[PDB]
Amino acid sequence: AEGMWVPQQLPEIAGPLQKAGLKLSPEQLANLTGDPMGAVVALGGCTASFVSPQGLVVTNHHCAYGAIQLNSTAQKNLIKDGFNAPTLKDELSAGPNARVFVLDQITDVTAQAKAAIAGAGNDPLARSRALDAFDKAQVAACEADAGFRCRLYSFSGGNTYRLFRNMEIKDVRLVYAPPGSVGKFGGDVDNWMWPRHTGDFSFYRAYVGKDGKPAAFAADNVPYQPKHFLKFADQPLGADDFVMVAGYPGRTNRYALAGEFNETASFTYPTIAKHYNAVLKMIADAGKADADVKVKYAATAASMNNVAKNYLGQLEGFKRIDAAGQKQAEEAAVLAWLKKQGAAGKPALAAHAQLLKHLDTSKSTRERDLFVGQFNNTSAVGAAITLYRLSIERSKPDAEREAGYQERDLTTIEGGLKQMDRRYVAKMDQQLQTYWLDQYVALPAAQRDNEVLNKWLAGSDAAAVKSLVNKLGGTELGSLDTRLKWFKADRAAFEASNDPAIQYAVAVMPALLKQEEQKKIREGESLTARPLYLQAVADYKKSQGEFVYPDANLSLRITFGNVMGYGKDGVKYTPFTTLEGVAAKETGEDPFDSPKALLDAVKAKRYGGLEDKRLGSVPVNFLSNLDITGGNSGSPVLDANGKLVGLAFDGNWESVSSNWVFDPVMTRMIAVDSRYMQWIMQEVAPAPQLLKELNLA
Amino acid sequence: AEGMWVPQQLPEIAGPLQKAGLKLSPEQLANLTGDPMGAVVALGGCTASFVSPQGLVVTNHHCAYGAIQLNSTAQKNLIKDGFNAPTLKDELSAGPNARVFVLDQITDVTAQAKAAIAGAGNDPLARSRALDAFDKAQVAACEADAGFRCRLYSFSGGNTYRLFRNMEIKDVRLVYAPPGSVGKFGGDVDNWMWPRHTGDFSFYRAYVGKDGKPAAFAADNVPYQPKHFLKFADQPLGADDFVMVAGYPGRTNRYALAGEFNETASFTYPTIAKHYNAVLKMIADAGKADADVKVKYAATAASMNNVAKNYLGQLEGFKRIDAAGQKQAEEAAVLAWLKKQGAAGKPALAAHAQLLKHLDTSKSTRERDLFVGQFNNTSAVGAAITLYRLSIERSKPDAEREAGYQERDLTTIEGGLKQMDRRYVAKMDQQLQTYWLDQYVALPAAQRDNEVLNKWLAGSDAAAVKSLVNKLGGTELGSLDTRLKWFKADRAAFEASNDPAIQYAVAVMPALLKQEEQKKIREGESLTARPLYLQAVADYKKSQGEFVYPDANLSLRITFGNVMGYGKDGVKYTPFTTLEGVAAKETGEDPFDSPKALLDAVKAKRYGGLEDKRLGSVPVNFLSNLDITGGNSGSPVLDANGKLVGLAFDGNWESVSSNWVFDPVMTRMIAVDSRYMQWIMQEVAPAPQLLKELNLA
């Protein structure tokens, strides 16, 4: 079924859920802290679920990848080898910034948010500041009880606001990862593709302090005891079976203006794809020379590969469904249905005119802004800018500090400085600085007008780039102890430093704050125009009998449907892959190099009690017509009785354009079968202690 | 069904033919001069069929490609634009060497053939001379009457010989080619692939003299009047329907020794694929600088692309099926079942050992021969060699003159020299010479042992190479008038010449004569072993209950089966593509750039009365489980009633390794549907005259 439904829309989908084959009462799904919705957790960018009363959490391999990478070395490469913790004391810290978010409360605060915004009057900057102040005040009251973290969400262009309250678990530990040849079987070749043969799962455990409250990593912390956890399905999942997913999809753009789509399609996607492919080649080469570079950059390399391929896929999808034409036709239909509405349709019409006007601004600057933005987010330089910015915000009252630099953010900023120790090699950062400066100096003189960067380059040729990178090479911010000292320093200490990266951060900061003010002004202009126009598109969609649900915004959504394949001319993709399909893709070369224990077990047909007689094998991955996107990785797939049948992890090639224009015919979720998760942990990369904790043997 | 069955095996397959759904009687197929088998013709390298009483001939577009290419220019480009002859007098000559062969009779000459080898003593070089002299004279006697070509065919190793008598039509004209965007839709992306959306068809017309003798192009020649032609099917072809193919498969190697295979798998296919891909980037890049080079090399570029991708497919198929393992499992089981025969065993076992001994001889030379052989079959040099070789062979008598330089070949040679006119560019041929020399002077010293070439280079680097390519540039064999002058010259004239390429021709020839004598020795040894060993295999296979049928050898063969898809894990390929699948592949860029009339007709559902309701569209290509290979292109696909339902043109990716080890699971023929052929000539690139002549519209 189409739609990323908010829990508040359960009454609207209760009928369709039952019709598709849900056997729980839809009222059971409305209890978001009860069984089974309360077992579903957010990780920040990924979804997961509790699967034991001792706080075992299951997610995707590609979601645990960062945690596995932080715990890898060139000699003891867990990304390659996998990992198991036979006892609680063997479990590895997933890193200081790993989180498990357990939902406590959702509060509708629409009337209060709109009243704060209207109270600002006509000043766009005051409007942006009023919503910021309202956001901070709501979150401060909601976070007064220790161990809770709150977030304000904006839905449907700012027509609805809800405050989420979560228990914020801060001590997350790695329990199990299959080898990378299972967790990431077929690598970037099979990424965004069906048929798929990927064992994309891994396990964490949530810990709390001995007092029961969230705490950073400590030896005397103890497993979290969740109220609810999911059980693995006893009923075999088959073709046509009902499935549903609860999770935290990140961002969709289905309510984008036609010109927002056109800019993304003609500039953003092809440009990012081109540069990311070129940076990835540089990182791959550096990794072949030094396995420490390969391990330190592995999370960055996987993320960048996934984004570049996704973008190429969206561009192919747009041509497949003529997204440009569908956008143009819908925008024309809305603007005509408004006109026929008389005076009542004039505000929305004028909101549209204001948003249309906002687009033009980001032409002629957009290549400069990309290169300078990427240069400033290289490791040493980005740490310098963050650290200098924090020293400035520290001197203000907490309520007046920029979102991201308040007291409630200090442990996250510190965590980032710590995690950089496992993700930084000076010789690799130098090559990334060179790459983005080289793009900047290759711009036309009118466009390469960043005055501070022009002063530091003092040239526009290869010699000038090399010269600036040589100077910045004198930085001490590669040192963890140096970063942690700067984290505590006042703004005068930064302004007196002769560290070249710190000098650079001090030089660029005035122009960074001015650019922030311009953004906040544009934000304040959208806070009145975007809701009026997006409400009109929704009203028009409702008048046309179309499904109305908000674009994804990192909050909890429900999607449902059935196990099923899809087709193109001369091809029908069947809903399951099987063990024999993994072995048929074997080449013995990364990324089609399965463990010997897997190839041996498939050759012997060791199906370990997990064979589905309908398939004649153990299923590996499956397709269904659910509506997921980035953020839904690791979402539990529940059957008709709310039992776990698999994890969401990817979409088929033709699905990725559904970010902009939903296509029901070729949009499928790719999930890993819970039976393959069990088979890997039984026959290939054993976790007997885990199968026991899951009551699976 | 497996098997390239010779017509004499029709008794063996008459059951299967009827169980498969043949409505004709198998007796009716036995009559090779009858309906429909008499409508089937050989083009030498392609199959075709008579489709009208006025000698109208149907084949594939990639079969007519050479003809279209000979009639194309950078200004008037019939590859890109296509072609139509509304009247007989608009039909363009297909080329001097373009042929239609009509089968007249087959006679078994086994006994007489084995005598000619037996009574040669037991010397190698005498048996080479012996069989040749027996073939030469047996063909002369068969080609008594003016308008016939005959050929001796070596089957099942030499356990069968047969003589083929054909009427040789020497005036073939192009009637119709669709646009290259239709005839070669998907180009080398979609080549050897399903799903496929290629209208791979074109029409010739066969011409004779007014007397009724075949004759060369004369403007007063008349259309041939075949005794039989095929009718287009009126019954709509669907999934599971019976189909059969009759045609002229070139070469299969399912009876080769494990060592012949392992040499091909380990050296020949990887080396040729590597060097052809490099040579193809040269032609590609050069063709982009010169729109004249592109047209002139288009035929060799298409051919080499086809072979390079085929060899990559074979290598992957060998790994999929464990070709190496199955062969050594057969070549070991044969030798055991012969050591279990005792007395009857020993000839087969000795015969094996003789062939085993002939394998290693090439090992230190292959990289040299290939690079040299290639350099020497360069155009300028290749012309220069063959002319001088003829001027040498002229002064000898017939029946002692080497086959291919005889009286009956003289017309074919001049053909070559004329055709070269539309296939030659100096700076391309130099680039080509440059490549194959650059490869030669890359070899180690001990292998870089061409007396003449190292001589002519004086050094072994890019400078020495550039030296000789710029020397050979001085030639004037780049002129047709020059080439035809030398065609009729005597020998002494060649030796006097100061043309660098004639001089090179003269210099290399003694070494060429020597190497061919040795070549002829080598074959001699084989002519007694091969029949002995392959007959044991044939009986070992017979004993196991495996289909027994000889390797393809350019003679007439029957294959049959049913319209059906194939699969692999997660995917079922359905047996038909449709118009909508063509549209869906549209990118506006080569090779996914359909005629606007096709995209417009599709969008509008102009199905033109050709829709199959079971598909809800007009079908484009279809799959079936027949057994075809190179040479089968253009073969008519016949339904249950012996009506034309399409033309064979390709195989799916997995099918190509069946050249060594047949696999019935993933071997399918790809054929173009007769309704797509009609549809194209109705709605897209019109041919109302052909529609009339075929009795369709």
Ligand SMILES: NC(=O)C[C@H](N)C(=O)N[C@@H](Cc1ccc(O)cc1)C(=O)O
């Ligand atoms: N290695 C992977 O498989 C990552 C995967 N391509 C991915 O990015 N998954 C995201 C989930 C997703 C599912 C379906 C669609 O259409 C988009 C995104 C995720 O990581 O959350």
Ligand SMILES: NC(=O)C[C@H](N)C(=O)N[C@@H](Cc1ccc(O)cc1)C(=O)O
């Ligand atoms: N352009 C093409 O489609 C050429 C095609 N790949 C080809 O080589 N066809 C040959 C026929 C053939 C069919 C099936 C198999 O397995 C091999 C070859 C041909 O030209 O005869």
